[PDB]
């Protein structure tokens, strides 16, 4: 009975592997981009051209 019950857990081990180990393919997506600030320094334009 013990071996028969352990068989099911042994089979579920592969499913656990597929569930868990595969997510390690990439996890750096959480990193956010720059999104920098100007600190009132990025104002170097006039009302000359707006179409381009």
């Amino acid at each position: 009975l013990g071996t028969r019950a352990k068989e099911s857990l042994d089979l579920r081990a592969h499913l656990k592997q597929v569930k868990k180990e595969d997510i390690e393919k990439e996890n750096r997506e959480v990193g956010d981009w720059r999104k920098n600030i100007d600190a009132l320094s990025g104002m170097e334009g006039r009302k000359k051209k707006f179409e381009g």
């Binding site: 597929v18 569930k19 595969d22 997510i23 393919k25 990439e26 997506e29 381009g52």
Partner: protein, 371 residues
Amino acid sequence: TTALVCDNGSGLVKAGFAGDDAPRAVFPSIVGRPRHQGVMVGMGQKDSYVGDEAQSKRGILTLKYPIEHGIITNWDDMEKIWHHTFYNELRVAPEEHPTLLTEAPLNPKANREKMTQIMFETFNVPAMYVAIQAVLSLYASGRTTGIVLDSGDGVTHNVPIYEGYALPHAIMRLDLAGRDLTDYLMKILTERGYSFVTTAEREIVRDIKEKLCYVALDFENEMATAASSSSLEKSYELPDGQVITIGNERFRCPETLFQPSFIGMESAGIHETTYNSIMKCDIDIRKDLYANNVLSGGTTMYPGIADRMQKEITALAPSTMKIKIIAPPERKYSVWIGGSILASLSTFQQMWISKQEYDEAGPSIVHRKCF
């Protein structure tokens, strides 16, 4: 190389490279042409904004989903969506990456064949494979048995599986899903005075549904309580002010799932099509299916559904069986996580539909052994 696990869906396109935990780019699948005239010259106005860009300019667009109920009704728009997904949200040319699309059960053949023909001729992928959206959601749970109810936004389907052997005669596909709930909510909001008509305001009603609605544990008691007290009325601020107050519309919108007679549909709710799907199975695997009922898909994220469904099935099922409802917190992306796991397997690496095979048998190869 790495595989591209795309998942067309209907309402949100979820994509990302195989082997990760979450999709890289998730964005609504809408393509909206501008409808007004346009007077500024040189503003750089495009002819069609797709994806998440058209959810910011939706004030002057006419958004239209290219996928109605699982099936694809407008192939040019779907091609545009795929092109955007590959080139701008992932920035990987498809010439060097296998793809793994997903498809609802019991869909028309022509849809699948056209999908593979597009992927092989226009984008020119090395190899693509189409998988049923429920088997993946069963992969993600780490099970190998169980009956999965994948209530997406387009179509709700209920595929029972035992020991890896799917039961093709017990698939119950029902076409009530999140979109019909959005339309019904938009229709019952008119009982207080708020009228949403434009295709852009459907998005606002969808946001209301996501943020406020919940599934009642017992419907009549909630209807009686909301009609006497006022402890349920939750308010919400529109995109311009003028807050609105939702009363007993909160639990009446998602109740349509368990009583499809509200929107005039004949069929039985998602609480009874699961029991019917179980009863069509053999008499010896019903206990395992009872104990491993799996929920997936976006629409099963309503607060309080995993208890209402369990109560209903326990009412229907025999008193001795144990009813358990698996509701993982990562429900929305369950199908895509399962897709990543399946694409990352070594045993699966020879099931792809290689391009030379398509060249020899035409698009009808998908129905053949390479399923």
